[PDB]
Ligand binder design. Structure first.
Ligand code: PPE
Ligand code: PPE
Lengths: 401, 401
């Protein structure tokens, strides 16, 4: 009986733990369809061309590694704001925003969570969509806020239950906080339609709710970055001052370098200044200043015309491939003779498919075929390659037959 | 009256803010002696040779950027443990430790702070030495613990007030938490003597206090890394199970890449396993997984014999230079005709000198000479170069005359 005799065995992360389990299997045909990580058509980690050139630029310049200001790389901070808001945006033009480099999406989310905990005097409730990325709970819960829920997904119909959402949302207490996924909702792969978004705006505005946008997949919903930032831009434009978290982990394939940002849209550039002051203060006693590599790479691509353009081509490339894989998946299922309707697989967008498989099926999949996915039936289509869509489909079928 | 009408202008970080102020001065002779950042003899940011080769190795291998496990790079985690504990260590050999990659020193410190908040059921008090790095307060305070103090520095005598420390320490309530700087105490540059450390061990052990070591400057106290880890090793060896935070920001000049680690010494490898589980759980909803670059670079140097050896030469090189600058500083002061005893400047170790200048003098220094330092009179000798020790000394003198 020492200091930690009492500390119990905590369980493995529902998402990140799949990769740990996957790592150990000896099956040569194994597939890691758990975390949303882009794999190229060979089924290999893919580092974009533009990322590769960004890094070379950095190398060549023989840059130092001195500490970055607490808020991050100005150039990256400003270009991230700009990427979300759009260059024409009044918010951006007027400087009514504060963007701070964050430790990827998760890092940004928690900074905001912490910021709200401290400065959002109107409420302690955060409404998450049913269902949501498992991690939104703990992120909010550890920061000190309460979690609530709003209906979103209709499993019966494999789509968004708009009526349920609107009902739930029209009733959230005023001045509460609502978390919205900007695009490629995780894990359903179903976003509201633009008409739909417009109706949500109204209710949010009307109920005077703080809209918190989680934008982890800008460019993976349509394959177009501006198109994917529509909702977000629409709300700001309707006069809704949101807070936002951005991740460059998927769209730039910067996973491990941890590049991201957290933004608050304020009333004036002077409020923006005061909020920045306080955000610095929160970040300081947390990690002091942020990791420079991801931010340097992203800044160079973003601010370098030829780089940026290459990047957009590369993003289309990625989404495209994901599409082909959905398609094929479905085809192979029919080929295999599957009786089930697998239309949701091609209807869903972003990196995954919310399959509907029950936990007994998931289990079999891992054990008989060594195909790893989250227990909720969510699979990452992002990680399928031409060489194993066949295998995937056959398995799905066997376990479903 | 929007959401953030109430959020007030927070002040600039007492340490990091000096660099912000410094950045704006137009004086061509300006000197940034605030943050502890190594400058080469030309007064330029210095990226070690071995760091440069580590990066080239990485480049050459065309490594991916997939996400690292929540606890960090195994290789880096294990080599950090090893760097602190020493290779012969029973703790290490036996695997009674858990080391987790942290976002530099600050990142590691806060992870531990958070861990204790959650699992240290014996107390909410953390005793810091008087004085300490300004940031220890907020780090502990934001995590949820209470701050206490123990006497350390004797300004009258420009040294460690051992009697006061021992008195204060012999009285801290049992099972409390005491933060100790492993070496190169920040900001006094005065460490306990080995005899002294031995006496501290006893009292800590006797009072059954949780010893929390902050090891930010391993190699900057003596210019020898094992020598600098003595105290730390001695406590573990006396049967004191510490928690520790390591930073590679100064000794490897990795400032902005944010590489560091947090370790807990446990009873067995099985407790170690349970603690790891819980640490993962804490990190997950905080930043998810850590920045890979700093960790990849540090892992390669540490685990690469020729790299490691080069690294130790480079560390000696750095400490040496710091020594020369102290020396010279003092010489120039006499040359200038300073009446004061400046012996503390050469007596102090690590990257700074706790000068004793009053705030009015600090102020003049910045305004007449554009020499930036923290308001407490702490200056970073680390950043002085042969070309400006003269200027420095003349200024000090003018403002002191
Ligand atoms: C909605 C969502 N929001 C934020 C993030 C933040 O990611 P990062 O920048 O790494 O902090 C992720 C990653 N979630 C995918 C990646 C694995 C993970 O969970 O992490 C996933 O759901 O598989 C999200 O899916
Ligand atoms: C005692 C101490 N502990 C931990 C750290 C953590 O540093 P990092 O790995 O960057 O998180 C520092 C840096 N403190 C010097 C560097 C500037 C800073 O304060 O940050 C300093 O005191 O100037 C310390 O001086």
């Amino acid at each position: 009986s020492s200091w930690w005799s009492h500390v119990e065995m905590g369980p493995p992360d529902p998402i990140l733990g799949v990769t740990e389990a996957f790592k150990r299997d000896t099956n040569s045909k194994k597939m890691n369809l758990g975390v949303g990580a882009y794999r190229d058509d060979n089924g290999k980690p893919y580092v974009l061309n533009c990322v590769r050139k960004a890094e070379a630029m950095i190398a060549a310049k023989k840059m130092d590694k001195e500490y970055l200001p607490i808020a991050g790389l100005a150039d990256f901070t400003r270009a991230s704001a700009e990427l979300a808001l759009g260059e024409n945006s009044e918010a951006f033009k007027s400087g009514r925003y504060v963007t701070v480099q964050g430790i990827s999406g998760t890092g940004s989310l928690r900074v905001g969570a912490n910021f709200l905990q401290r400065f959002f005097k109107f409420s302690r409730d955060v409404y998450l969509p049913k269902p949501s990325w498992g991690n939104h709970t703990p992120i909010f819960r550890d920061a000190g806020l309460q979690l609530q829920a709003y209906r979103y997904y209709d499993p019966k119909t494999c789509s968004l239950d708009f009526t349920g959402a609107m009902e739930d949302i029209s009733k959230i207490p005023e001045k509460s906080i609502i978390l919205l996924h900007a695009c490629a909702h995780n894990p359903t792969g179903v976003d509201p339609r633009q008409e739909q978004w417009k109706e949500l705006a109204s209710v949010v505005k009307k109920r005077n709710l703080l809209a918190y946008f989680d934008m982890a997949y800008q460019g993976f919903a349509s394959g177009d970055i501006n198109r994917d930032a529509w909702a977000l831009r629409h709300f700001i434009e309707q006069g809704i001052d949101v807070v936002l978290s951005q991740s460059y982990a998927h769209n730039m394939g910067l996973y491990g370098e941890r590049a991201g940002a957290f933004t608050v849209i304020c009333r004036d550039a002077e409020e923006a200044k005061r909020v920045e002051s306080q955000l610095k203060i929160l970040i300081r006693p947390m990690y002091s200043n942020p990791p420079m590599n991801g931010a340097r790479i992203a800044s160079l691509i973003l601010n370098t015309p030829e780089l940026r353009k290459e990047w957009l081509v590369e993003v289309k490339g990625m989404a495209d491939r994901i599409i082909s894989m959905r398609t094929q998946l479905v085809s192979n299922l029919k080929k295999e003779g599957s009786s089930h309707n697998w239309q949701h697989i091609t209807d869903q967008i972003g990196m995954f498919c919310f399959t509907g498989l029950k936990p007994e099926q998931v289990e079999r999949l891992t054990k008989e075929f060594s195909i790893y996915m989250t227990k909720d039936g969510r699979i990452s289509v992002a990680g399928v390659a031409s060489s194993n869509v066949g295998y995937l489909a056959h398995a799905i079928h066997q376990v479903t037959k």
